[PDB]
């Protein structure tokens, strides 16, 4: 009789830049996922296999809840198909999902003046990421014949590059939180 | 670190005509790498971006009639222009869009293409 | 699809020449305005500013840059003999996912 702590991964107080999104395995619980989208305050949420509502009155071996922050403009990359440095070197959807993605505005929570320069986006990776993978690494980027063998410099950038998050900035340039769930004897509603 | 343009010239309107643009010390399969170009006279119009990963982004006023591609084993980009037009008719140059730890860096010289009969 | 930009700009050795380059709220608020310099028209560009402000390497400390929302602008600071070229700006846009150039300035001093 134990619910799904989705409020556990939505509500958190503190997500995760889109380099590094956060998984949890919801399992083992009761979900009405109609009360998700009923907690209607969400911007974007499309679920590309079915309804909340059909598969409320469904089950699967596990749900995975991936969470991270992206900007505006690119929440149009968190989908099916779609092509962009989110999507091609930070997270890329598989061309066949059949989950949920869900968004909502964060301006208020992580947006400070000057800039909450602690969300990081991938600019440099040198192939797009497969469905569902995972790079965190920090080595310096070779766009050139030298080896950089370890300092930043002229043609040895460094990947990992910092969303600029100022209040004052524009709409599709402000935070949203973004969680995507996926569904793969556990969990029912 | 050099880039030379070298595709070609005069073509019959509707004609096609590739260019390309030989890299040295950038390593083009790996840095975003971007066409522009300049009409006689005028301004600046980007035209195509490449991704290191894929993904092109073309202008609308060429997107199908134009291609953009990177040589495998060979440090070379491309734009195939085809369905070509007297508008067209501009000088085009490779350049290394390095998105915002830097910019757009390291010009080539610039092959000139005359669309006209 | 440009960016507006003056046609033309003048001023004595010594002064500053400030261009404009004004544009959307998905053009130049934000996604980073680049400057270019080309002598020629058939030249090779020169990035004098990049991300808004910020300057490359081998570029005076002379050329400087400011942002106002709807516009940013370049300081053509201690404003050289050479200098008098075509001066171009650039930015991206997700609305039509491209680069926005600029009419050009041509900045002309007078000696």
């Known amino acids: 009789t134990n619910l799904c702590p989705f409020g556990e991964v939505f509500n958190a107080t503190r997500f995760a830049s889109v380099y590094a999104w956060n998984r949890k395995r919801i399992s083992n619980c009761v979900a009405d996922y109609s009360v998700l989208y009923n907690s209607a305050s969400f911007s974007t949420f499309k679920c590309y296999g079915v309804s909340p509502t059909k598969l409320n009155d469904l089950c699967f071996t596990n749900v995975y809840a991936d969470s991270f922050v992206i900007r505006g403009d690119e929440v149009r990359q968190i989908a099916p198909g779609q092509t962009g440095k989110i999507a091609d070197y930070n997270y890329k959807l598989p061309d066949d999902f059949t989950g949920c993605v869900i968004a909502w505005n964060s301006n208020n929570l992580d947006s400070k003046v000057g800039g909450n320069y602690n969300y990081l986006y991938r600019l440099f990776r040198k192939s797009n990421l497969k469905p569902f993978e995972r790079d965190i690494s920090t080595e310096i980027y070779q766009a050139g014949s030298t080896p950089c063998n370890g300092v930043e410099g002229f043609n040895c950038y460094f990947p990992l590059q910092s969303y600029g998050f100022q209040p004052t900035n524009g709409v599709g340039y402000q935070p949203y939180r973004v969680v995507v769930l996926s569904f793969e004897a556990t969990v029912c509603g | 670190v050099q880039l030379v343009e070298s595709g070609g010239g005069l073509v019959q309107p509707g004609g096609s005509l590739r260019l390309s643009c030989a890299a040295s010390?950038?390593?083009?399969?790996?840095?975003?790498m971007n066409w522009v170009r300049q009409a006689p006279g005028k301004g600046l119009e980007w035209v195509s971006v490449?991704?290191?990963?894929?993904?092109?982004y073309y202008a609308d006023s060429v997107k199908g009639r134009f291609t953009i591609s990177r040589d495998n084993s060979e440090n070379t980009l491309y734009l195939q222009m085809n369905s070509l037009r007297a508008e067209d008719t501009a000088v085009y140059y490779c350049?290394?869009?390095?998105?915002?730890?830097?910019?757009?860096?390291?010009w080539g010289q610039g092959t000139t293409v005359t669309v006209s009969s | 699809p440009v960016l507006t930009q003056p046609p033309s700009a003048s001023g004595t050795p010594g002064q500053r020449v400030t261009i404009s380059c004004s544009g959307s709220?998905?053009?130049?608020?934000?996604?980073?305005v680049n400057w270019f310099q080309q002598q020629v028209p058939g030249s090779t560009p020169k990035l004098v500013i990049?991300?808004?402000?910020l300057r490359p390497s081998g570029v005076p400390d002379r050329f400087s840059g400011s942002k106002s929302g709807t516009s940013a602008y370049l300081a053509i600071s201690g404003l050289q003999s050479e200098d008098e070229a075509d001066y171009y700006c650039?930015?991206?846009?997700?609305?039509?996912?491209?680069?926005?150039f600029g009419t050009g300035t041509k900045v002309t001093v007078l000696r």
């Open positions: 709220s998905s053009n130049v608020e934000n996604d980073n």
């Open positions: 350049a290394r869009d390095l998105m915002e730890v830097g910019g757009m860096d390291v």
């Open positions: 490449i991704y290191s990963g894929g993904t092109t």
């Open positions: 010390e950038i390593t083009v399969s790996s840095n975003y």
């Open positions: 650039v930015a991206w846009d997700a609305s039509l996912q491209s680069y926005v």
């Open positions: 990049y991300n808004d402000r």
